Design a protein around this ligand. Structure first.
Ligand SMILES: Cn1cccc(-c2cccc(-c3cnc4c(c3Cl)[C@]3(CC[C@](C)(C(N)=O)C3)CN4)c2)c1=O
Length: 291
């Protein structure tokens, strides 16, 4: 079973499908309208045939149905019908920040500051549940028509959680195993502070339209990050950005996780605690998008 609370019902008994969303980047996703209330939702459809391995989807639904926070895209339930699984989600009408900056160009520092504050609020919540997103990036920060910010897509988190469960299942007799081997098997080898680093990279992405080293082969990037002398990335255009933004990048991109600030701590940083950060900043961005 993929989840004990799935609705065994055709979602089209409750919703009218209106438009495909995401260009396929996120799978088969449909804008849909509640037949009763008229509210809009996003329905993601995934194949779920009787013999398929459902462990990762099981974990993703378990994450979704235990999150309830304004800055996390809302989960409304899942439908299993004729071997298709539909996940019903809050609809974010402006798409992801990547969809937006590909049209508008780089965000303003204030716009990035608001986005970062809202994401950190979602992360603080997730981390208070001992959850890790593990895939923070512009493509997974969604914007609704009101200019509000929603973290989305726990697919990677689900894949990781499912992998940990499987390795635990087959870890075998432990009596000769070193503690660090057991720890990696039970806990994964890292912690939630990886999300803080990814948010730092995301801030550069919103500022420059590419993450650092985007034009370097991925395997080379992975190897470089493991060298003892690896240097955290920086914003390239020094004069475009305030000292507070440069420092925000410096502290989020602390390479030792034992020294990297938590989400709650980062929320006290000058860049994200300054006044004037509200959704009007993103409505400005969406107005630029419209022109
Ligand atoms: C043509 N057009 C018009 C308007 C908006 C878009 C558009 C573009 C990119 C993203 C989205 C989007 C909005 N809201 C959403 C989701 C998504 Cl993909 C998810 C469902 C699953 C999900 C992956 C998750 N795991 O949360 C994200 C559910 N909430 C919409 C568009 O393309």
């Amino acid at each position: 079973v993929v989840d004990p609370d799935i609705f065994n019902r055709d979602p089209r008994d409750h919703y009218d499908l209106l438009q495909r969303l995401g260009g396929g980047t996120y799978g088969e996703v449909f804008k849909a309208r509640d037949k009763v209330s008229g509210d809009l939702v996003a329905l993601k459809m995934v194949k779920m045939e009787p013999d398929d391995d459902v462990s990762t989807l099981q974990k993703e639904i378990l994450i979704l149905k235990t999150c309830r926070h304004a800055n996390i895209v809302a989960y409304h339930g899942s439908y299993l019908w004729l071997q298709k699984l539909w996940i019903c989600m809050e609809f974010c009408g402006a798409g992801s920040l990547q969809d937006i900056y590909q049209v508008t160009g780089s965000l303003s520092e204030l716009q990035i500051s608001y986005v970062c504050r809202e994401v950190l609020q979602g992360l603080a919540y997730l981390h208070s549940q001992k959850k890790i997103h593990r895939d923070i990036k512009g493509a997974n920060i969604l914007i609704n028509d009101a200019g509000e910010v929603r973290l989305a897509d726990f697919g990677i988190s689900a894949q990781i959680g499912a992998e940990l469960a499987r390795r635990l299942e087959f870890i075998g007799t432990p009596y000769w195993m070193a503690p660090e081997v057991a720890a990696v098997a039970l806990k994964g080898g890292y912690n939630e502070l990886c999300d803080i680093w990814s948010l730092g990279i995301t801030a550069i992405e919103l500022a420059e339209l590419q993450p650092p080293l985007f034009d370097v082969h991925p395997l080379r990037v992975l190897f470089l990050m493991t060298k003892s002398g690896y240097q955290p990335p920086r914003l390239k255009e020094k004069g475009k950005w305030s000292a507070a933004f440069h420092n925000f990048i410096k502290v989020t991109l602390t390479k030792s996780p034992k020294k990297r600030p938590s989400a709650t701590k980062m929320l006290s940083h000058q860049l994200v605690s300054q006044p004037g950060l509200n959704r009007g900043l993103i409505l400005d961005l969406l107005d630029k998008l419209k022109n």
